[PDB]
């Protein structure tokens, strides 16, 4: 009966998790598509790649801290290698445990698009290797830590912070992560002539990073479906929402980018769908699809505001806007939580949006602190024992190099 | 009890829209496949783009039209913007709902690969909400119209027409839509020889194409699947036999093709594998596979003699088949409902076949009649303000072209 | 009640064999991947046609020899075209059926890989239809053939024999029968200079073979989930399990490769992660997530080896390293299973791992024997009525002719 129920339970679980595995492909073919030709190799390559390590670090470390039992509402403390998951009352064990890896591999993946091109191999390994056992799960045990061990809660979520499927603790801890990995590598060599102005570097692979837009959108349906941690008629509902805001983000992207630029550019328009995305994943389960069609909207002209601002204001690059996209879309949607979420959701301990708005900008803000900091030095670090960037004849020449023979 | 398997019937429903969802992508991956490698471009974008439309179409008036409150059993006047979906007593609200608008999608990106590769961008994106506003769902009413809201019928339901997952709602409506354009836009600038020969443009990524049929394919499972709108044994019988349809229709191609052409043309069996596929959209959950093996080995066979049909006597240029495949395989499948369908699924005022071939062949003139002639009309007053074609210098160079900068 | 869990356990499997089906879409872009870009048609096109025929071969005949009523535990003798299906108590049906064809399109598809490049298309498609007709199904009813006809065996079965998901079953049979052909149809002309040494053909689109990594990967969580044939708790413990051996495949693969060839080779990457795959699917519902990252290490760098001593010391010209990740993957994890498993799980009559060895060893001796050699024969008979290479000017220009016009 409630046997029953749970087992439902575990199928939903795993089939949006397996959903979620399947935007790693999405975000590979993305990268590539939005790639120069001659470095397609090591893009795809790193991506797979970040897949292992990410699963591996997940599972003997990140898990645990993340959602372990609580110290403090600061770290967790056992769960390590999955230690004992089974007798946990909470019923969906492995289940949960898979749904929760595959959001870690998509935290950490958003790195390689940030620093593709100039970055060598070591930087993104053991990125990836420090975001998910340090950075990921720690900022997660503070903003989930209540979710699966019994009695206990992490310091953010305490505090009333909101975040459904992970707007901030998958997108905005990975795109501010990547942001200090792209200051730190620096420019793509050709990117900035000597009066400033931007040149318009790869994008060699439209239909493939179009492919990359259609299952990445795929896989948010688990992403954000799967966050219900359950099968009730509220499926229907977080996914019709999470459609309704990559749809409406895209056409205000269209109408925005037309009458700005007088044409239809395809990388703000993907760049705003996938913004959308990332910030309909803070509140998908508690907004009606006309408020996720408004923050669709909002969100896809603020996202390629963000886009072009980054560019040519601050002077990072991003070969594939994944600042924009997942830094600054998930603090548009994890803002809009307070604007747009339904009351009854709302945890601010006054139950007001002005309230509730002030605890998801602190969340915005420790999440930034936290991962761009953390990022800065672990980059500094890095840096002081292996250079960071590849040379400029291999960039020039392309990091595909080994298969030449 | 009735809740939880109400819960099992929101899983399935929201997981085969997710799937159909995906066919999106299998459209895109098709039709760029089919293309000239210097239109990929364009053809990737539509092709997203109209998924951005049709949803925000559907969810405004077209779910409304098609499935709301009958006025007369012609139209629908309600549920507009989803107006109280939650309060109605049928099951399935959300889920239905946007089960309905990824086919209302597939119905509408069907146009794209008829027009490809001359037409412009204006004739594409209002075709799309036009069909999504107006053709599909209306005809939608008239055949499904009974199916969500409490104590209706559209007229042709009411006269007993059969369309399990919509081989003429779907994809006829949006194949004969796709016609009418193609007929107003004209044949690709070197299609036709001054003695009236064919040449073979296109197909110029079979790999692409074929990874498109697959997806198709897979996606179909779920069309198909999902159509039943709750779970039951009978979940497998409907995808075996959609299966089974596919892979007969692929090998009738391959001796067919053989026999009367001494060599595999890759075009010609895709064609016939779509085909089959559409075709069994009208009758997976009431034929036997046997009877879904002949459905297959018919519409494989009459597909590929449809496509040249169109090309060479017609003189319609249609790049990737999609009258044939979506139009002429969506009227050979809703005919053979009444051949081959379990005698107590017939909805004919008498339960005989003659009698149900009669109501099935009506649907189907009254499904060109609608969407050919609407189609006709709305490409007849639109180019009265907008070119439908691009410059032929343009056609030459290839749409591909603000990507150079 | 039981009613509702049947409907459950019906959606899981059918949801299971549709992304068992998209294995053949990861298959079809893996082997491109791999291929010379002249090739790639080709080798698509064998692809989407080897389905054709697995389905109805398997629809036919191979399913009843499978799984059909036992005649001495050898042979399955009823459920020819599913011939009453519906009326066996066996409670998952179509579902089931549907299931195992998916297997089946697995087990015959390996061959493409193996021959690509130099084959020409008869040896393909009656390869496949010989191996779906009599190989794959026999050695199917030795090993599985209790699984669905009421109170009966296969012989090896009764011996003990465990293979949870196909390790050997599908992999190692496919493998060994690709290996045969592979024999048979010789070498690719530029494989083997003079003096011994093999050079580097093909791998032209590394991005298209992580795609088809991707695909796989995803698509092995329902081969392995789905073979629970259930629906419970375990289904998180399979997926997760199946998760971790491939990451600790890759990992192992990239430690190995750096330290002994100083590069990462993409080539080794794959193979290893895919034969873990294949190695876990023997065991991942009997195994705890630990042993299934020790099952990976090992099964990654044993494939490696296996991968270099098969194409350097056999001198067996294996364009995707087919025979490396399913033949030897398969061997490998099916010999883990007495090594790892639960000891609840074992057959083996006195209950010990040793003696489970013993039998798990005779299960791969006797599939070997039986593919391997039937396959043997099989393409000796038919090169004695038809070459089973092209010729070597078409070798060289590409087996891609035909679109050209
Ligand atoms: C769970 C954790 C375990 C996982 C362990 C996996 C083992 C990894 C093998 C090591 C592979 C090293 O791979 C190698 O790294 C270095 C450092 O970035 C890269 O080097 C690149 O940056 C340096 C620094 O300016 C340049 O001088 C060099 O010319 C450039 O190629 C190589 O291009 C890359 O080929
Ligand atoms: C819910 C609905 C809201 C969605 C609104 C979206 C806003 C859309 C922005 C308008 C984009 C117009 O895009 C533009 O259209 C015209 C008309 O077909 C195309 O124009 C094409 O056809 C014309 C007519 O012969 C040719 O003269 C022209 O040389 C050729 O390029 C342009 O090539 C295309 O770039
Ligand atoms: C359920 C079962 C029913 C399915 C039936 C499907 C019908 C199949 C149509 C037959 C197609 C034959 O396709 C054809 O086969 C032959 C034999 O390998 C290939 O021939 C190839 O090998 C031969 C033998 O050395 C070479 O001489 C030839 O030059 C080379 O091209 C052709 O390249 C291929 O085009
Ligand atoms: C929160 C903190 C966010 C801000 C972080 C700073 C970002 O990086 C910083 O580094 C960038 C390197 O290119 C910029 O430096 C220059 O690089 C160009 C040549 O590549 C040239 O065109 C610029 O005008 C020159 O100033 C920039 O001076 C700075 O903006
Ligand atoms: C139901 C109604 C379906 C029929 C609709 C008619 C289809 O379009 C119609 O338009 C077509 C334009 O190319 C054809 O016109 C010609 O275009 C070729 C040069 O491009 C030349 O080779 C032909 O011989 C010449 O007649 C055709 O004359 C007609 O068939
Ligand atoms: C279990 C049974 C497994 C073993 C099966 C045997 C595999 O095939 C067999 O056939 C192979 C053809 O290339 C090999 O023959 C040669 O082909 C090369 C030129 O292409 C040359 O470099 C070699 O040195 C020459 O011996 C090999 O002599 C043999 O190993
Ligand atoms: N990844
Ligand atoms: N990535
Ligand atoms: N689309
Ligand atoms: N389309
Ligand atoms: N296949
Ligand atoms: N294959």
């Known amino acids: 009966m409630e046997n029953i129920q749970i087992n439902i339970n575990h199928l939903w679980v795993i089939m949006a998790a397996c959903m979620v595995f399947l935007m790693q492909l999405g975000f590979t073919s993305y990268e590539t598509g939005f790639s120069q030709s001659k470095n397609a190799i090591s893009i795809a390559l790193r991506?797979?790649?970040?897949?292992?390590?990410?699963?591996?670090?997940?599972?003997?470390?990140?898990?645990?801290?993340?959602?372990?039992?609580?110290?403090?509402?600061?770290?967790?403390?056992?769960?390590?290698?999955?230690?004992?998951?089974?007798?946990?009352?909470?019923?969906?064990?492995?289940?949960?445990?898979?749904?929760?890896?595959?959001?870690?591999?998509?935290?950490?993946?958003?790195?390689?698009?940030?620093?593709?091109?100039?970055?060598?191999?070591?930087?993104?390994?053991?990125?990836?290797?420090?975001?998910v056992a340090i950075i990921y799960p720690i900022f997660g045990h503070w903003a989930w830590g209540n979710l699966f061990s019994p009695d206990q809660t992490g310091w953010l979520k305490e505090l009333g912070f909101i975040d459904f499927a992970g707007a901030t603790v998958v997108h905005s801890i990975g795109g501010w992560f990547a942001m200090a990995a792209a200051i730190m590598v620096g420019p793509r060599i050709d990117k900035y002539n000597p009066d400033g102005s931007s040149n318009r570097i790869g994008l060699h692979?439209?239909?493939?990073?179009?492919?990359?837009?259609?299952?990445?959108?795929?896989?948010?349906?688990?992403?954000?479906?799967?966050?219900?941690?359950?099968?009730?008629?509220?499926?229907?509902?977080?996914?019709?929402?999470?459609?309704?805001?990559?749809?409406?983000?895209?056409?205000?992207?269209?109408?925005?980018?037309?009458?700005?630029?007088?044409?239809?550019?395809?990388?703000?328009?993907?760049?705003?769908?996938?913004?959308?995305?990332?910030?309909?994943?803070?509140?998908?389960?508690?907004?009606?699809?006309?408020?996720?069609?408004?923050?669709?909207?909002?969100?896809?002209?603020?996202?390629?505001?963000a886009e072009g601002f980054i560019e040519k204001t601050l002077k990072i690059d991003d070969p594939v806007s994944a600042i924009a996209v997942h830094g600054v879309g998930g603090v548009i949607g994890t803002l809009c939580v307070a604007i747009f979420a339904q009351k009854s959701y709302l945890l601010a301990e006054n139950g007001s949006r002005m309230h509730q708005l002030g605890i998801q900008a602190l969340g915005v803000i420790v999440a930034f602190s936290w991962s761009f900091g953390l990022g800065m030095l672990f980059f500094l670090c890095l840096k002081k024992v292996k250079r960071l960037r590849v040379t400029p004849e291999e960039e020039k020449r392309g990091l595909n190099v080994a298969e030449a023979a």
């Open 47 to 131: 991506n797979l790649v970040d897949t292992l390590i990410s699963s591996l670090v997940f599972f003997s470390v990140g898990f645990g801290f993340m959602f372990g039992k609580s110290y403090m509402g600061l770290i967790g403390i056992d769960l390590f290698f999955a230690n004992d998951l089974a007798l946990h009352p909470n019923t969906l064990s492995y289940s949960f445990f898979f749904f929760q890896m595959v959001f870690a591999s998509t935290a950490a993946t958003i790195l390689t698009g940030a620093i593709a091109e100039r970055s060598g191999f070591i930087p993104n390994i053991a990125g990836t290797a420090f975001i």
């Open 205 to 305: 692979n439209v239909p493939l990073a179009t492919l990359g837009t259609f299952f990445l959108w795929f896989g948010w349906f688990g992403f954000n479906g799967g966050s219900l941690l359950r099968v009730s008629v509220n499926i229907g509902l977080v996914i019709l929402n999470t459609n309704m805001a990559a749809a409406s983000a895209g056409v205000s992207a269209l109408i925005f980018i037309y009458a700005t630029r007088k044409r239809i550019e395809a990388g703000s328009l993907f760049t705003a769908i996938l913004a959308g995305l990332v910030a309909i994943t803070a509140s998908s389960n508690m907004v009606t699809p006309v408020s996720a069609v408004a923050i669709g909207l909002i969100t896809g002209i603020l996202a390629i505001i």
